[PDB]
Amino acid sequence: SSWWSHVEMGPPDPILGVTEAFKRDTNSKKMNLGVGAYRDDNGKPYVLNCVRKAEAMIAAKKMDKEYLPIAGLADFTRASAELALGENSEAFKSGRYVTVQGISGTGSLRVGANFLQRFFKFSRDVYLPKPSWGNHTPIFRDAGLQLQAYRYYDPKTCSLDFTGAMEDISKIPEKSIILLHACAHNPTGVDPRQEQWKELASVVKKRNLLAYFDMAYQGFASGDINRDAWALRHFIEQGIDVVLSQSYAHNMGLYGERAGAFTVICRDAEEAKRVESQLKILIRPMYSNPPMNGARIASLILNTPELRKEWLVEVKGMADRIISMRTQLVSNLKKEGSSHNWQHITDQIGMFCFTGLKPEQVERLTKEFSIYMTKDGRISVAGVASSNVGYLAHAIHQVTK
Amino acid sequence: SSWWSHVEMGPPDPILGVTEAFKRDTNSKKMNLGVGAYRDDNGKPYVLNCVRKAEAMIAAKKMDKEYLPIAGLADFTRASAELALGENSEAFKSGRYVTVQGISGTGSLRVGANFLQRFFKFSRDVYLPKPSWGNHTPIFRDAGLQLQAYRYYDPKTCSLDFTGAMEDISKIPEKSIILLHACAHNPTGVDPRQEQWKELASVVKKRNLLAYFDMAYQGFASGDINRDAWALRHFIEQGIDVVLSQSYAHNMGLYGERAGAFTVICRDAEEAKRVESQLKILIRPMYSNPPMNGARIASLILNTPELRKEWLVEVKGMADRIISMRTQLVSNLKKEGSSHNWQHITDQIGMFCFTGLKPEQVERLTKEFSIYMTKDGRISVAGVASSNVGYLAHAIHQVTK
Ligand SMILES: Cc1ncc(COP(=O)(O)O)c(C=O)c1O
């Protein structure tokens, strides 16, 4: 019959708009600063050498394709927890955590959202920083939670509004949920420094808030897996039992294979088995059991010393290329005669950078220079290469001079 | 803390318990008839030759691991639509269908369920047959719909309660949702014959019911992909715009890779685009995009003549082993001197068989013969092999005589 006549055409994604225009452009100097995945120095997708080798191992073993347990590959969940909490972590060693494999970071955040909706009886409010990854809204919203926000980004300085953040967080009703980015805040790239993190943890402890860490870039951010997980670990050291989402999309370049994990820090191993049974019950009617390919690759790497070692070098390489590009962009802006302060470009961390450009300026950048970005002045640093950093520098100077 | 103290231990999975108790048994005669996946004649997992050939082809190309679009691999979704509807299906050729890649059968069912909750304004009720796959319930329940039922299985004769089905469907409120298993009904193995399907279509047409088909065993049930898709194709052909879920778990043996799809039959190409946009809005906050490996493997086989040709041979090979084991069970039961009527075993279709055995008899089989199965009397034919079929007939005879 005519069941669907009332379904309206959904709104178009702006990122898709930028990508389509970029593809149409004929100018060979075109840059795509809307990319959400790492690109090497030649602007190409990069499959890690350690993933090629792990894949090669799998094939040689003639593995079956049987269904994985609901919670996922045990070797993968254990390794994920170890990676995040630290091998000599008290939480890890006493077994008071529960980790289940999720569909990358997004599926892992959703399982968590769904878990909180069902069992977190104290509140339905989730406080997100201003701004946050766009998908974070519909994720918590479709799950049944209420969205709240706390000040985070300071447009005046293109850095942390520490004063605004501490004031907001201090007024959060106790036992509410606060979403924190572990590192490489998406989309601004501004992260608290260690001393700021110490103040932040004191207050969440004091106000007895449930801390939900989104850790989508461990290793990929600064090049150091322990450094990137520092604030998460500090929070747990201070006695804050968090919930966390992990993604292997960026740090292992496993994008389409969807490898990720969801973890809950419990009081003890007893309590962990209980929440693990509830997590299994929720997941079965969602998708029954997780996709095995990304987890088998991730597991092999983390668990095989030779591989793990090669992985840390390559993840460091990715991080270093991006720091390199941020470094190069501010020196070339000085070189061009920009009198403006571009240090936020080097203070920011990870793949996304909030530049401070205004909408008028990004339009000119697109129209006249064939540099494609979203109107919020957000740039994907994976889109810059050694061959075009100078150009971008030039282009930025011209629209801000 | 003490966020999770009130979270209790969830109930034990009864399938888990049979498999597990099966493991703990020492008897060299032991048999696991609770297995949910195909097993060869030696009781081993079976990865198809055609899938090993596709995996080598993917390996040779050195493909990237970039994210697939939200809706999935286009070569996969089109081929999936084509296998279900038929190449010269009117619905296929006009392009009045929308096919989205889902996480195997279960995630496909669930995005479907969530789509209905959000856009099916006509009703909140879904009518499942009595009985249906266990997971069908939480799927719809967690999605937000209300469960209802229609008589299906006749315990008295271990066949279809055709009359009861027809009376129950005739009375379903107009514009209700009805779930139909396209073939090889789970868990009984009882399917309507071609003429009863015809009669069912007309009532569904008359009551103006939204028919949701669950097609998890296309090709794997009878050895023939067209015959297995007969009922679906008939409904579309009579002008019933159906909703469908497909799984490649069993027919391609892709279990853990998670390849499946969800399709909606629309009025035209224009409406298909509107519904496709909303489905994307829905999936994004669920898991962002689907896993690429299973979809890549399945797209190659379906799209490559030589591989598709091989695949058809293997799926038939699987269906025949199953039919052979059904046939041999009945003959051995007769040979044993059993006087009960066991024709239902040969009348049933697919991997699952409702034997008619009572709880205490199942218990007798477990305790004295080392035969593991659920207390509902359902056996998974995959666990029967040429070398133990004799044994199984004998035990069943001893317990029922
Ligand atoms: C803040 C943030 N969270 C989570 C993710 C997870 O993406 P995926 O679903 O590929 O794991 C990303 C990157 O897309 C992200 O930037």
From Swiss-Prot, chains A, B:
Q: From the Swiss-Prot or TrEMBL record, state where the protein is found.
A: Mitochondrion matrix
Q: Which GO BP terms, alphabetically?
A: 2-oxoglutarate metabolic process; aspartate catabolic process; aspartate metabolic process; biosynthetic process; glutamate metabolic process
Q: Which cofactors are named for this entry?
A: pyridoxal 5'-phosphate
Gene3D superfamilies in the record: Aspartate Aminotransferase, domain 1 (3.90.1150.10), Type I PLP-dependent aspartate aminotransferase-like (Major domain) (3.40.640.10)
Q: Principal place where this protein is found?
A: mitochondrion
- Show which residues constitute the signal peptide: none
Coiled-coil stretches noted in the UniProt entry, renumbered to this chain: none
Q: Is Mitochondrion a UniProt keyword of this protein? A: yes
**What keywords does the record list, in alphabetical order?**
Aminotransferase, Mitochondrion, Pyridoxal phosphate, Transferase, Transit peptide
MF terms in GO: kynurenine-oxoglutarate transaminase activity; L-aspartate:2-oxoglutarate aminotransferase activity; protein homodimerization activity; pyridoxal phosphate binding
**GO cellular component terms, A-Z:** mitochondrial matrix; mitochondrion
Residues that the record marks as modified (N6-(pyridoxal phosphate)lysine) are H250
* Tissue spec. comment: Detected in heart (at protein level).
Q: Give the record's family classification.
A: Belongs to the class-I pyridoxal-phosphate-dependent aminotransferase family.
Assembly and oligomerization? Homodimer.
Q: What does this protein do?
A: Catalyzes the irreversible transamination of the L-tryptophan metabolite L-kynurenine to form kynurenic acid (KA). As a member of the malate-aspartate shuttle, it has a key role in the intracellular NAD(H) redox balance. Is important for metabolite exchange between mitochondria and cytosol, and for amino acid metabolism.
Q: What else does UniProt say about it?
A: In eukaryotes there are cytoplasmic, mitochondrial and chloroplastic isozymes.
Its name, as the record gives it, is Aspartate aminotransferase, mitochondrial
What organism, scientifically named, is this protein from?
Gallus gallus (Chicken)
